[PDB]
């Protein structure tokens, strides 16, 4: 869980940065040997100096897209995990297939916002409604990314200890662990039975907010016009589906956090309500 969901943040900030230009690309076109050298430099540059536990990390890639989890930069890769016998009581196929190919549905958020922000670099008249949507649609990524992982963190570890350390017996220990694993995931809407599927459709315009507007941060002289003609489109593409899909997931009576945390704003609390 340290290496999934980018939690070794001091590695990952270096990771999607030094070799970014040959990781980010829209359709395949990665060069894995570059990030394999950065896997060494950026880990030693990160916190792996606290404990040298790197060797378990191995890169893995898609046999059959989503459903095994239970574009590049977008969803680029995910990491394999195998161990020797006493740890293998804990790490085994039904669990390690939630390893191997997960956090990819989290990686695309950090890519798409940072690539949108690379457009923001190319301009640090000028109708500020376009600038405000660049801020606003980005916040839709940033605060849900906060919700997806910067929510339940300590408790699951506090639970895991007092569960396993007291029990001692594999007949319950594996139940405690497999329960803990899903408990950590239940922040991440990566786990959702409806696939929250309007968000996946919204993603198709989200990437255009990066690439087509990066293209515009040349063709604006090579934002009052060719940004603007899409600002109205992005605006109510996102704001319609965004302010119905939380209501679609109105299941709960540390929990109910996805809904409570983008209810919180008060304006655009919803537009198409659950009730």
């Amino acid at each position: 869980k340290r290496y999934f969901l980018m939690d070794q943040g001091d590695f990952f900030v270096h990771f999607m940065d030094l070799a970014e230009e040959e990781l980010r690309k829209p359709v395949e076109d990665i060069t894995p040997p570059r990030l394999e050298a950065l896997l060494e430099l950026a880990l030693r540059m990160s916190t792996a100096n606290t404990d040298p536990f790197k060797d378990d990390l191995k890169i893995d890639l898609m046999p059959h897209d989503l459903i095994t989890q239970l574009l590049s930069g977008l969803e680029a890769f995910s990491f394999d995990y195998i161990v020797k016998w006493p740890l293998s009581l804990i790490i085994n196929r039904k669990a390690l297939t939630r390893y191997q190919m997960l956090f990819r549905h989290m990686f695309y958020c950090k890519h798409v916002e940072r690539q949108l922000c690379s457009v923001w670099i190319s301009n640090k008249q000028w109708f500020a409604g376009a600038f405000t949507l660049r801020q606003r649609m980005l916040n839709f990524v940033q605060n849900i990314q906060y919700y997806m992982m910067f929510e339940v963190m300590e408790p699951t570890w506090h639970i895991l200890e007092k569960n396993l350390k007291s029990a001692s017996n594999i007949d319950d220990v594996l139940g405690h662990h497999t329960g803990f694993l899903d408990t950590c995931l239940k922040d991440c809407m990566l786990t959702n039975p409806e696939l929250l599927k309007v968000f996946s459709k919204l993603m198709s315009v989200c990437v255009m907010f990066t690439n087509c507007m990066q293209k515009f941060t040349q063709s604006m002289k090579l934002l009052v016009s060719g940004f603007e003609a899409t600002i109205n489109k992005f605006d109510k593409n996102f704001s319609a589906h965004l302010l119905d899909l939380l209501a679609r997931l109105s299941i709960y009576s540390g929990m109910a956090s996805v809904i409570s945390r983008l209810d919180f704003n008060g304006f655009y609390t919803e537009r198409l309500e659950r009730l």
Binding site: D10, V13, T47, E113, C117, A128, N143, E154, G266, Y268
Partner: protein
């Protein structure tokens, strides 16, 4: 790609120097540059990864007409840093002209430390806003970074020259240098001596010292706010995503700060969390609202009151976002270095566009209107008078800040689709 955390002018070499001393405390470094015994950090970006752990910071040490620099260089931390970064006005035009005629070696030093990275993600100039070498030379370099490296984020960390009633040309230098921030810089973070004053009459039995003791406050605040850029966690590890979620326009880039435990010189995180929303607790100057509220808690932890934290401050509603869209409180945990002490056990801090900065911009602008109308404090020296034609450097800067006022006021309201 990295943050070259520069620092310019003699006051800048107090406050940036104090920041690097506080950062070496917060990471955990003894005054020789020996790291603490656990090694927890994205180290290389901020202290350089040497062979034998000579962790030298990524900050320059430039001045004009040195008068405190030799005292700073005799301090015990003279091997915690001493690269080739130390190199040589009262009113702003002299520093501009002296820097232009001296620039062959100081900009070489800046370029060498700029080349001491993979690339730059930001040039953060620790900068006095109105002082005699922060103005002129500091502002001149702040332009030159925008002239030579225009698209990468030219940045500043600063104190707003908002003491009531030190420098003899306070508003004239301030709106001159605010042109370099609003136009030529791309993101800036700033503190206010009046907000620090009312906080001092809560935290401390203190008075006269003020500015030179605000060196401690500025530094501890700057360190504790940039935590997200320098410690690991599940999210928010990077400048490019995070700061963009605060800054829409090429103008609206003046982030400001708020901090909970003013009793500092186990404590329930519910009262810690509500305290960050109070009018008592922001360090810059109607009841203005938050465009964002970062709070990765850096102090002690409770495994279920951290669950209650956000859910409870939703209810207390002491200051709302008054937003335009998805803006809500970015709470999290953070990592903290072991082995460091603390008598008071909990802290939480935001750097964000809180909209109070709009009133502080109208404070420097009403102060400059008061200069444009009185003629008595025009400060029309011969060294400043034929340097520029019409003070396009400032009378345009009033308009460029008025644009920023028309955007911040709009950001305060739900009608942010335009100005107003």
């Amino acid at each position: 790609r990295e943050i070259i955390t520069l620092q310019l002018g003699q006051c800048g070499n107090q406050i940036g120097f104090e920041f690097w001393k506080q950062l070496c405390a917060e990471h955990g470094i003894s005054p020789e540059g020996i790291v603490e015994e656990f090694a927890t950090d994205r180290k290389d970006v901020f202290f350089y990864q040497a062979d034998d752990e000579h962790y030298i910071p990524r900050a320059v040490l430039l001045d004009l007409e040195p008068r405190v620099i030799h005292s700073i260089l005799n301090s015990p931390y003279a091997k915690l840093y001493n690269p080739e970064n130390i190199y040589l006005g009262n009113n702003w035009a002299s520093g501009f002209s002296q820097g232009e005629k001296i620039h062959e070696d100081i900009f070489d030093i800046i370029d060498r430390e700029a080349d001491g990275s993979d690339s730059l993600e930001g040039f953060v100039l620790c900068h006095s806003i109105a002082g005699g070498t922060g103005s002129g030379l500091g502002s001149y370099l702040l332009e030159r970074l925008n002239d030579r490296y225009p698209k990468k984020l030219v940045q500043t960390y600063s104190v707003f020259p908002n003491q009531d009633e030190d420098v003899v040309v306070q508003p004239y230098n301030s709106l001159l240098t605010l042109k370099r921030l609003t136009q030529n810089a791309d993101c800036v973070v700033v503190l206010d001596n009046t907000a620090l004053n009312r906080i001092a009459t809560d935290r401390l039995h203190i008075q006269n010292p003020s500015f030179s003791q605000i060196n401690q406050l500025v530094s501890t605040i700057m360190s504790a706010s940039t935590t997200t850029l320098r410690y690991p966690g599940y999210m928010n590890n990077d400048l490019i995503g995070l700061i963009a979620s605060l800054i829409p326009t090429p103008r609206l880039h003046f982030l400001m700060t708020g901090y909970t435990p003013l009793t500092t010189d186990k404590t329930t995180v519910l009262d810690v969390m509500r305290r960050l929303l109070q009018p008592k607790n922001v360090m810059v100057s109607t009841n203005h609202c938050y465009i964002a509220i970062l709070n990765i808690i850096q102090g002690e932890v409770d495994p279920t009151q951290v669950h209650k934290s956000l859910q409870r401050i939703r209810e207390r509603k002491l200051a709302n976002f008054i937003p335009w869209g998805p803006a809500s409180i970015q709470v999290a945990l953070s990592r903290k270095s072991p082995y460091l002490p603390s008598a008071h056990r909990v802290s939480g801090l935001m750097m964000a566009n809180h909209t109070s900065i709009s009133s502080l911009f109208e404070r420097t602008c009403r102060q400059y209107d008061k200069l444009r109308k009185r003629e008595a404090f025009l400060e029309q020296f011969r060294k400043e008078d034929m340097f520029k034609d019409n003070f396009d450097e400032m009378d345009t800067s009033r308009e460029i800040v008025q644009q920023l006022i028309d955007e911040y006021h709009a950001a305060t309201r739900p009608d942010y689709i335009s100005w107003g």
